[PDB]
Amino acid sequence: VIPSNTDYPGPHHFEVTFQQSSTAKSATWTYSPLLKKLYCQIAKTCPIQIKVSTPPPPGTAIRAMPVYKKAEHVTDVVKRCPNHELGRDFNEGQSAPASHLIRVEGNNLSQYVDDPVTGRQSVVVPYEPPQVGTEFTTILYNFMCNSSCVGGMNRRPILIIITLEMRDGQVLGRRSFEGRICACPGRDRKADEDHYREAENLYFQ
Amino acid sequence: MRVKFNPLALLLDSSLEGEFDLVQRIIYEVDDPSLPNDEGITALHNAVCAGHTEIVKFLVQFGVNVNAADSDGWTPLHCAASCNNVQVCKFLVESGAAVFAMTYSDMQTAADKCEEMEEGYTQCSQFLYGVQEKMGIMNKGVIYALWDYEPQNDDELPMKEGDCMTIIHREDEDEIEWWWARLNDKEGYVPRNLLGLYPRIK
The missing domain is CATH 2.30.30.40 (SH3 Domains)
Known part of the structure; x- marks a missing residue:
């Protein structure tokens, strides 16, 4: 059984968005709406905004699971590379198991799930409404291995699947996007967007 | 606590003590000379750390695993480097040593293991960082x-x-x-x- 990535706004019109992401080469992360692709630097903070039209039921959670994008890789569990797993850096005194790729930053209620049947690793946080007079709920994420990590992602592309779930695991909403953990998000976005507009004959400027 | 004298145990203790003659003899009686003890240490790790160059050259030329990693990821090249032994480092590199192999806890290559306060630092570290760069x-x-x-x-x-x-x-x-x-x-x-x-x- 392969995790489903199909977008599902659902009954609460579940949206996953990103604040104005710097197009600068200095940027630690950037999101491409054109490609539905997130570019991030290893172990850096990536704020993701969640929006709902109506509050979901009590005990609702938000899961984030990484999955390999290509069909020939999809049965392989997205895990951390052996080297970063055994390393001391970012592993000393952490709540997160050393093998998990996705971490939640600054939430004591986060849960690091290792499914005993599928072997799939993910991280779950309870749903929390926005602050008084705010539009979005912010979740801070960290991606702990580069896409290029030999033994881990090993240059294979991935999807990040965000799903709004009931306490029993029933799906209320889902949004997915491609993830890229690299040294230069800003440069890699620009290059990819330029190649896409050319290949797809998209009118620009 | 029973002291083990089986062929692998002998080859390892012999390599550490510097009993070349015994090493040359016990090696043909051992099923796999590249096989480690419970802490991941092999006869070559012992030969290198104890500074027995004659056993180092013998074991390596015999066909022993030159890139054997102990429980902490240390290979014979990490051990030779920690001793600032440029001569053994050069020999191991020429014998297929993994220059970019890293220790587990810290992600340090052999070149990082060189000891700054010990003699032969500049020559050993500059040689290993040189190979990494060239x-x-x-x-x-x-x-x-x-x-x-x-x-x-x-x-x-x-x-x-x-x-x-x-x-x-x-x-x-x-x-x-x-x-x-x-x-x-x-x-x-x-x-x-x-x-x-x-x-x-x-």
Whole structure:
């Protein structure tokens, strides 16, 4: 059984968005709406905004699971590379198991799930409404291995699947996007967007 | 606490003590001389740390695993480096040592293990960091695969231990650990850390 990535706004019109992401080469992360692709630097903070039209039921959670994008890789569990797993850096005194790729930053209620049947690793946080007079709920994420990590992602592309779930695991909403953990998000976005507009004959400027 | 005297136990203790004659004799009685103790240490780790160069040369030339990693990831090259022994480092490198092999806790290569306050530092560290910097550029970009490699992507080259290939591009800016190489007629990316300047001794 392969995790489903199909977008599902659902009954609460579940949206996953990103604040104005710097197009600068200095940027630690950037999101491409054109490609539905997130570019991030290893172990850096990536704020993701969640929006709902109506509050979901009590005990609702938000899961984030990484999955390999290509069909020939999809049965392989997205895990951390052996080297970063055994390393001391970012592993000393952490709540997160050393093998998990996705971490939640600054939430004591986060849960690091290792499914005993599928072997799939993910991280779950309870749903929390926005602050008084705010539009979005912010979740801070960290991606702990580069896409290029030999033994881990090993240059294979991935999807990040965000799903709004009931306490029993029933799906209320889902949004997915491609993830890229690299040294230069800003440069890699620009290059990819330029190649896409050319290949797809998209009118620009 | 029973002291073990089986052939592997003898080869290891002999390599540590510097009993070359005993080492030359007990090695043919051991099923696998590259096999480690409970802490991941092999006869070569012992030969190197205790500074018995004659046993180091013997074991390596015999065909013992030159890249054996103890429980903490230390290979004989990490051990030779921690001793600032440029002569053993040079010999191990020439015998297929993995220059980019890292210790587990810290992600340190052999070159990082050199001791600043000990004698022979400058010469040993500069030699090892030199190999790390010149590999795939020097010797007309000729390197060797020290492990098999099964590609995960279309633009990657399959490798077999001992395979000799030429490095076309290192791309030290974008994906430092991946190099564009040429093996036979084909070209692809290979992981730098599986490669050596010279091949292993069979």
